[PDB]
Amino acid sequence: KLVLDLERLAHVPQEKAGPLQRYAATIQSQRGDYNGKVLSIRQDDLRTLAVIYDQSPSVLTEQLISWGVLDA
Amino acid sequence: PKLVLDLERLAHVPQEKAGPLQRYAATIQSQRGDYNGKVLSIRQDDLRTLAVIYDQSPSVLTEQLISWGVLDA
Ligand SMILES: Nc1nc2c(ncn2[C@@H]2O[C@@H]3COP(=O)(O)O[C@H]4[C@@H](O)[C@H](n5cnc6c(=O)[nH]c(N)nc65)O[C@@H]4COP(=O)(O)O[C@H]3[C@H]2O)c(=O)[nH]1
Ligand SMILES: Nc1nc2c(ncn2[C@@H]2O[C@@H]3COP(=O)(O)O[C@H]4[C@@H](O)[C@H](n5cnc6c(=O)[nH]c(N)nc65)O[C@@H]4COP(=O)(O)O[C@H]3[C@H]2O)c(=O)[nH]1
Ligand SMILES: Nc1nc2c(ncn2[C@@H]2O[C@@H]3COP(=O)(O)O[C@H]4[C@@H](O)[C@H](n5cnc6c(=O)[nH]c(N)nc65)O[C@@H]4COP(=O)(O)O[C@H]3[C@H]2O)c(=O)[nH]1
Ligand SMILES: Nc1nc2c(ncn2[C@@H]2O[C@@H]3COP(=O)(O)O[C@H]4[C@@H](O)[C@H](n5cnc6c(=O)[nH]c(N)nc65)O[C@@H]4COP(=O)(O)O[C@H]3[C@H]2O)c(=O)[nH]1
């Protein structure tokens, strides 16, 4: 389950989190989902984010877990 | 049309017509743990799955769902 902590994500500097921040905003606007605390995404979004980040999905997961943004 | 289904409108649909969609609905709800209201929205791509389960065209399925009042114009 890919579950993002939105309050934490917002405080990661753009230089690390910029593309994930923008990706999450596009999901929120498509959904009209502005709950303010959590955003769960499709497993297939991980694949997409990995392409954007130029990292493997597993390395990306580790990075987001290490930022405390993604639950482990 | 966005597939926003009214599970209560659907319940008033005769079982021969409604069955497959009620079964599918129950499967999505279980996969999600989503049991908190009478509206179920599903993916646009899910219309293909339902088309296959009913062996009806997607367009035909959408039109009838709308007639049963289950789906929004
Ligand atoms: N609980 C749950 N509900 C689901 C799931 N999949 C679809 N739905 C519901 O069905 C809707 C339509 O799904 P869609 O055609 O894929 O249309 C979706 C999709 O194209 C996109 N979208 C929303 N969220 C995500 C996401 O996490 N990842 C991706 N790749 N696209 C998303 O924006 C659309 C509108 O999203 P919504 O307004 O939320 O509306 C969603 C939502 O009510 C699911 O795995 N779990
Ligand atoms: N706004 C929002 N909240 C989130 C998200 N991720 C997790 N949650 C929270 O965590 C629970 C489970 O989320 P879930 O796995 O999406 O699983 C959800 C989801 O599958 C579904 N669900 C609830 N509300 C909606 C809705 O408005 N539209 C759709 N399409 N599905 C919903 O019901 C399941 C259980 O919902 P709850 O336990 O009552 O409540 C939620 C919700 O409090 C997110 O991306 N957006
Ligand atoms: N074909 C189909 N499959 C469905 C539908 N609903 C749920 N599933 C399946 O059940 C898994 C869990 O749904 P979830 O707990 O709501 O957990 C969902 C949920 O919280 C959220 N999500 C994904 N897509 C959407 C979306 O379009 N709208 C919203 N509001 N939430 C979404 O992301 C989580 C993970 O998504 P997935 O990895 O795809 O994992 C999804 C997906 O495989 C559906 O309407 N159609
Ligand atoms: N992954 C996930 N996403 C969530 C959750 N709660 C809300 N959302 C997202 O936040 C959007 C707005 O939810 P809402 O207006 O509060 O209120 C919702 C809700 O009251 C209702 N609704 C429509 N479809 C569904 C559905 O399949 N299940 C549920 N439980 N409610 C739905 O219609 C409004 C819009 O539904 P959506 O188009 O789905 O759009 C939802 C959905 O994208 C959640 O627990 N998990």
Side-chain angles (χ1 to χ4, degrees), chain A residues 1-13 15-72, chain B:
Chain A
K1 211 77 174 45
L2 306 180
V3 182
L4 300 163
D5 181 317
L6 290 173
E7 216 130 25
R8 294 178 184 177
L9 173 54
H11 288 95
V12 186
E15 353 120 352
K16 284 182 183 289
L20 177 57
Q21 292 164 335
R22 300 195 301 279
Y23 199 91
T26 67
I27 289 168
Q28 292 167 138
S29 56
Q30 224 164 15
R31 283 184 190 184
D33 177 2
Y34 289 89
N35 74 87
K37 217 73 189 73
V38 64
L39 166 62
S40 303
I41 63 176
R42 294 177 193 190
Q43 201 66 36
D44 136 80
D45 290 317
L46 191 66
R47 272 170 261 170
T48 299
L49 282 163
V51 171
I52 293 166
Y53 266 88
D54 218 31
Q55 297 186 325
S56 78
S58 285
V59 166
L60 185 56
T61 293
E62 171 186 327
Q63 259 208 318
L64 303 181
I65 289 169
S66 79
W67 298 348
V69 156
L70 187 62
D71 200 354
Chain B
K2 190 170 180 177
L3 302 179
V4 183
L5 304 182
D6 182 329
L7 294 176
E8 195 269 356
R9 259 276 74 210
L10 187 58
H12 291 84
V13 169
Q15 177 175 14
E16 231 58 323
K17 299 187 175 194
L21 182 61
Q22 293 176 311
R23 161 72 185 181
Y24 183 78
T27 288
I28 293 300
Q29 279 168 167
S30 173
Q31 279 181 6
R32 288 181 189 181
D34 187 2
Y35 298 103
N36 53 97
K38 73 177 193 188
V39 178
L40 174 59
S41 296
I42 60 174
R43 299 178 181 188
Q44 193 49 240
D45 324 67
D46 292 346
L47 182 62
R48 167 202 294 119
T49 304
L50 290 168
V52 168
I53 291 168
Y54 276 98
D55 189 12
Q56 188 59 251
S57 84
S59 293
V60 165
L61 212 59
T62 302
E63 174 194 69
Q64 71 183 18
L65 268 174
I66 296 186
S67 284
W68 303 342
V70 177
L71 187 63
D72 331 23

